[PDB]
Design an enzyme around this catalytic site. Structure first.
Site, mmCIF file in Angstrom:
data_model
loop_
_atom_site.group_PDB
_atom_site.id
_atom_site.type_symbol
_atom_site.label_atom_id
_atom_site.label_comp_id
_atom_site.label_asym_id
_atom_site.label_seq_id
_atom_site.Cartn_x
_atom_site.Cartn_y
_atom_site.Cartn_z
ATOM 1 N N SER A 147 0.756 -1.098 0.062
ATOM 2 C CA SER A 147 0.023 0.067 0.017
ATOM 3 C C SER A 147 1.046 1.176 -0.088
ATOM 4 O O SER A 147 2.068 1.136 0.352
ATOM 5 C CB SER A 147 -0.984 0.011 1.373
ATOM 6 O OG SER A 147 -1.380 1.232 1.332
ATOM 7 N N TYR A 160 -2.634 -1.413 10.395
ATOM 8 C CA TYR A 160 -2.515 -1.553 8.774
ATOM 9 C C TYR A 160 -1.218 -1.129 8.341
ATOM 10 O O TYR A 160 -0.673 -1.736 7.661
ATOM 11 C CB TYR A 160 -3.634 -1.025 8.039
ATOM 12 C CG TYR A 160 -3.935 -1.222 6.556
ATOM 13 C CD1 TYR A 160 -4.406 -2.385 6.242
ATOM 14 C CD2 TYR A 160 -3.492 -0.119 6.016
ATOM 15 C CE1 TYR A 160 -4.816 -2.245 4.847
ATOM 16 C CE2 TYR A 160 -3.382 -0.380 4.497
ATOM 17 C CZ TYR A 160 -4.136 -1.508 4.001
ATOM 18 O OH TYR A 160 -4.203 -1.596 2.782
HETATM 19 N N1 NAD Z 1 -8.728 -1.372 -1.775
HETATM 20 C C1 NAD Z 1 -7.716 -0.321 -1.482
HETATM 21 O O1 NAD Z 1 -7.758 0.727 -1.520
HETATM 22 C C2 NAD Z 1 -6.294 -1.087 -1.503
HETATM 23 C C3 NAD Z 1 -5.004 -0.189 -1.473
HETATM 24 C C4 NAD Z 1 -4.072 -0.531 -1.336
HETATM 25 C C5 NAD Z 1 -3.902 -2.012 -0.679
HETATM 26 N N2 NAD Z 1 -4.805 -2.708 -0.552
HETATM 27 C C6 NAD Z 1 -4.540 -4.137 -0.278
HETATM 28 O O2 NAD Z 1 -5.080 -4.978 -1.309
HETATM 29 C C7 NAD Z 1 -5.313 -6.466 -0.864
HETATM 30 C C8 NAD Z 1 -6.770 -6.730 -1.541
HETATM 31 O O3 NAD Z 1 -7.680 -5.734 -0.926
HETATM 32 P P1 NAD Z 1 -9.031 -5.498 -1.680
HETATM 33 O O4 NAD Z 1 -9.360 -3.843 -1.674
HETATM 34 O O5 NAD Z 1 -9.125 -6.197 -3.120
HETATM 35 O O6 NAD Z 1 -10.079 -6.183 -0.655
HETATM 36 P P2 NAD Z 1 -11.462 -6.936 -0.762
HETATM 37 O O7 NAD Z 1 -12.222 -6.857 0.300
HETATM 38 O O8 NAD Z 1 -12.070 -6.548 -2.024
HETATM 39 O O9 NAD Z 1 -10.737 -8.647 -1.090
HETATM 40 C C9 NAD Z 1 -10.039 -9.183 0.079
HETATM 41 C C10 NAD Z 1 -10.328 -10.665 0.007
HETATM 42 O O10 NAD Z 1 -9.565 -11.230 1.033
HETATM 43 C C11 NAD Z 1 -10.276 -12.284 1.623
HETATM 44 N N3 NAD Z 1 -9.869 -12.625 3.134
HETATM 45 C C12 NAD Z 1 -9.974 -11.758 4.086
HETATM 46 N N4 NAD Z 1 -9.366 -12.484 5.328
HETATM 47 C C13 NAD Z 1 -8.735 -13.568 4.633
HETATM 48 C C14 NAD Z 1 -8.052 -14.412 5.317
HETATM 49 N N5 NAD Z 1 -7.824 -14.702 6.707
HETATM 50 N N6 NAD Z 1 -7.731 -15.435 4.656
HETATM 51 C C15 NAD Z 1 -8.199 -15.619 3.166
HETATM 52 N N7 NAD Z 1 -8.675 -14.778 2.429
HETATM 53 C C16 NAD Z 1 -8.971 -13.662 3.269
HETATM 54 C C17 NAD Z 1 -11.659 -11.729 1.702
HETATM 55 O O11 NAD Z 1 -12.463 -12.613 1.904
HETATM 56 C C18 NAD Z 1 -11.733 -11.084 0.345
HETATM 57 O O12 NAD Z 1 -12.123 -12.101 -0.832
HETATM 58 C C19 NAD Z 1 -5.373 -6.269 0.905
HETATM 59 O O13 NAD Z 1 -4.094 -6.668 1.107
HETATM 60 C C20 NAD Z 1 -5.145 -4.566 0.965
HETATM 61 O O14 NAD Z 1 -4.857 -4.375 2.253
HETATM 62 C C21 NAD Z 1 -6.294 -2.362 -0.775
HETATM 63 C C1 QT8 Z 2 -3.933 1.121 1.768
HETATM 64 C C2 QT8 Z 2 -4.878 2.025 0.872
HETATM 65 C C3 QT8 Z 2 -5.986 1.221 1.268
HETATM 66 O O1 QT8 Z 2 -5.896 0.047 1.648
HETATM 67 C C4 QT8 Z 2 -7.371 2.060 1.729
HETATM 68 C C5 QT8 Z 2 -7.129 2.261 3.281
HETATM 69 O O2 QT8 Z 2 -6.351 3.029 3.471
HETATM 70 O O3 QT8 Z 2 -8.210 1.397 4.107
#
Ligand code: NAD
Ligand code: QT8
Ligand code: NAD
Ligand code: NAD
Ligand code: NAD
Ligand code: QT8
Ligand code: QT8
Ligand code: QT8
Lengths: 254, 265, 265, 254
Positions: A147, A160
């Site tokens: 992130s 986080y």
């Molecule tokens: N959405 C954002 O803005 C963003 C930004 C940067 C980083 N991230 C990172 O990207 C990754 C994916 O996030 P996303 O936004 O696609 O979320 P999301 O909620 O769309 O998908 C996350 C998935 O992880 C699964 N999951 C949760 N706990 C779990 C566990 N214990 N074991 C296995 N599967 C599990 C959930 O069931 C879900 O299918 C994360 O690591 C998040 O921190 C997201």
């Molecule tokens: C890290 C950026 C992202 O995962 C959205 C948030 O801060 O919850």
């Protein structure tokens, strides 16, 4: 003169958190590029829906019930992939959740749950994957989903930010250790993406808090991240091993 | 589901330093992807050889005599590219030299020459390019050739390390200023690549130190890689094409290190 | 059990830009700690006012007319300090100006003037200083005045951000080269400080944007601090004295950001 | 003109891992500067020996049995300090251990023990400390003991590097959250110091592996770190809040 490589024909990938959001787009992108993909999620039903879509689109995939906080569930799920497709060439450690509270209010249970999913998940999936990759120095690729919060802080996200900073550390050790067995490691660091993890947060603003440190007030997209994940996974050399790459529209310039 | 974009059809690129080494591969790779490429370098004849290889493969290019230290040469060459191919979509500011001496011995004129080529060259080509890109907010991509030496130091390279650090600063400012005009900026940071700028260094340092060329390569140049591998011109040209062709501005202001684990960014 | 060292008795310091602002406080603080201080600035008369305040408090100082862009002025002024007080133990390369313009409008001569003062000034004073410090490996301390703008960008400050990024590079090279001669290097990276370089900016940007000076300060200058506080000249002079007096070379090559949480390094 | 501030008269500090090495020198340095100091360690006997030395040297100190992995032990130990000395102005989260193994060989138990001490300890001590500091916005200082391994990796130290990277993240969130209550946060990042944590490692070399990335082949000392910790703790303004400072003789130039 040269050209971009993006063929994953013959390769086997495991993506954790692949039932939803960024993981799902990475998985379907790898399957379109010809990889056989393990859709590893705690939500088995959601994982099987992703697999059904991938198979109907003409790809190969396998739904793997995996709580990445569980050593047994991680080891058994990696073995299921290897038994089904013959090996593991790519691991994306992507499963994550968000829990928002100031440090003085945050439950210790919530702190430990966040580190269990983000850091224990990363350790367990890495260890399981590299035990297979290290056989006969065939090697492979490990990508962590970091992130902009790998690199800087926001209010009310202590565990986080701690976890996403820690993933850089783990990636940098694996680059050093993995080099002797042809294993490369990367961290992708997105800014805000409109996934369920975020469209959740908006109710519970866009231009003034979430996109305030972007240069252009744009969200990062799932296809931005999936293209970068394919570019890394398909890359013909180990040149990017140990690196983080920030994909945030100018929020933290690395 | 998505896939990589690598089509530059209808785009016009200017690559400085494209007679040789990293710049030559980026220019040939951009032309293969369908861009028209300005080959900007000190000698028209040396640039024309890169143009010849691009035309042999069915691509479009123009030799441009441009000493990137000269405001008039930079302005005139950017205008020639625009007049020929109708615009400029991509700048790669890549021209460079290396002068090695410890600070206490280094000639002031060598310090100044180094900052002129790396830093004045980056300012002059940027400013001339964005004059065009800012028109009607058409936009475009500016790539600076940094180094691992954008992020850490080595002995006896003060002006080089100063300049490659400086290019991160220029890139970060352009990311903020350019956004309203659809201009995105990036720094590519290679480790050692066996271009002529490096192949000259190997025998020289072997002779000075009285060690084998293998020792220069392994114990000095690649000592902080994880795998004892040079970065290649194709590594850097693939990254340059990935960035130039990217469909969004998501990487604007970023540096990407391509170094086999030498400085993990 | 230990305690802070802050005694500079018997040390000789040169501070460039010491007629005003951050440099003046560092010079007065070094003199209070027992150093003899060279006050180097463009005008002998302006430098002499800092010398007058140091002498009033019982300290030793010398006004040195030094345009840090000039090789001959820098070499002559460093020699004058050495001839007067017997050596040079501490260099603070601090002289600076600000010129604000977006890249697409910025005059090439303003870009060049900015890099000359910040970057040529840092090279010239460093090289002249270490000639003396390297003798018999006596050693010494070189401090560069960087900025938060060593680490990130702001709009309309391309040459400034380029230069302050560059000074990290020069510092990192000097840390490696100087070690065998007991020379240590550091970069101090302040956030906004209300010196005359900044106090001029506030009314100017209020008038251009048609907003209150409170808005310029809070919504533009301090917007990325955690607590809406300016950094002070005493913050930076205390850090400079902590580093100059430190009993070991443990901080060699480091940058320290003093910015109330604006860029967390 | 100005001068350095180093008077902690009237202030109360809690140092974890204060029975030994870096923590012990920080504690005795704070006590010499006039602070009342809590010597918090899992080794109560060793903590009482440190206290006895501090009292004989003319300072005020209190031995506090504290396993920083235990919420109850952290909360009870912070309360003992506050009950004894009247408040808490300074927290140094310093307790740590090292466990060396490649990722493919490392026990999951050892991974979790490392994150429990380095990260859970940091969270629990921070939360307990700031609940007191936030009362009437009196504020205070929180220093984490990081490492050059906050910023880069070494072979065979995955969980340590992960933890020390994570401490930057926690520090950066606390700087943002704490600002409204006059709480500042810092990370000190030493290179190698000849403590028992390291003189242990040397048997189980100096110039060629441990000091290879220094510019001068020098160890960092306990007094280097204790001087920096006093400079930060005594600093008259919040100017350094959120910052890490590397003290490594040129190993990682931050
Ligand atoms: N959405 C954002 O803005 C963003 C930004 C940067 C980083 N991230 C990172 O990207 C990754 C994916 O996030 P996303 O936004 O696609 O979320 P999301 O909620 O769309 O998908 C996350 C998935 O992880 C699964 N999951 C949760 N706990 C779990 C566990 N214990 N074991 C296995 N599967 C599990 C959930 O069931 C879900 O299918 C994360 O690591 C998040 O921190 C997201
Ligand atoms: C890290 C950026 C992202 O995962 C959205 C948030 O801060 O919850
Ligand atoms: N080769 C490496 O290991 C390496 C690593 C990191 C960064 N770099 C950077 O990559 C860039 C390309 O270097 P290279 O290794 O391909 O070297 P190269 O010598 O093969 O090519 C450099 C080109 O720049 C041209 N050039 C030099 N001064 C010029 C000027 N004033 N105006 C116009 N053109 C000029 C030269 O004529 C030459 O054609 C440089 O900026 C260099 O610092 C190189
Ligand atoms: N004030 C801030 O907010 C701030 C923040 C970060 C960094 N800085 C840096 O701090 C340093 C000191 O700036 P300041 O704010 O005290 O400004 P200032 O204007 O009060 O002092 C700068 C001094 O530099 C001198 N100087 C300028 N050009 C010179 C030259 N060619 N040769 C010799 N002396 C010259 C000026 O005459 C003046 O006495 C500069 O390098 C500046 O970039 C300032
Ligand atoms: N020694 C080095 O080279 C070095 C370098 C950089 C960072 N560090 C960090 O400095 C800190 C102190 O290390 P050191 O070298 O002084 O080690 P040390 O072994 O000398 O002291 C560590 C102390 O922590 C205590 N401790 C261990 N587990 C504990 C727990 N669960 N709860 C409470 N107390 C506990 C030990 O009993 C001991 O008194 C650590 O966080 C370490 O990671 C050390
Ligand atoms: C960073 C440029 C390089 O790898 C060659 C050099 O340092 O001279
Ligand atoms: C970094 C220097 C500063 O705070 C003033 C400026 O940016 O003009
Ligand atoms: C982090 C440096 C130190 O703690 C020694 C070690 O790596 O075990």
């Amino acid at each position: 003169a040269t050209q971009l490589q993006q063929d994953l024909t013959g390769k086997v990938a495991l993506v954790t958190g692949a039932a939803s959001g960024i993981g799902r787009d990475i998985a379907e992108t790898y399957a379109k590029a010809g990889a056989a993909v393990g859709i590893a999620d705690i939500n088995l039903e959601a994982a099987q829906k992703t697999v059904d879509a991938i198979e109907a689109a003409g790809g190969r995939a396998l739904a793997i019930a995996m709580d990445v906080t569980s050593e047994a569930a991680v080891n058994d799920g990696v073995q299921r992939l290897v038994d089904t497709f013959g090996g593991i060439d790519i691991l994306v450690s992507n499963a994550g959740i968000q829990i928002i509270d100031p440090i003085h209010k945050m439950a210790f249970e919530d702190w430990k749950k966040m580190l269990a999913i983000h850091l224990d998940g990363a350790f367990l999936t890495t260890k399981a994957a590299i035990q297979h990759m290290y056989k006969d120095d065939k090697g492979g690729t490990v990508i962590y989903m970091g992130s902009v919060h790998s690199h800087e802080a926001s209010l009310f996200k202590a565990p986080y930010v701690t976890a996403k900073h820690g993933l850089l550390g783990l990636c940098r050790v694996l680059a050093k250790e993995g080099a002797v067995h042809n294993v490369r490691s990367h961290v992708i660091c997105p800014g805000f993406v409109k996934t369920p993890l975020v469209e959740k947060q908006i109710p519970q603003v866009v231009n003034d808090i979430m996109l305030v440190n972007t240069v252009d007030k744009e969200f990062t997209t799932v296809d931005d991240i999936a293209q970068l994940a394919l570019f890394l996974a398909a890359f013909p050399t180990n040149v990017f091993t140990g690196q983080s790459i920030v994909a945030s529209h100018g929020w933290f310039m690395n």
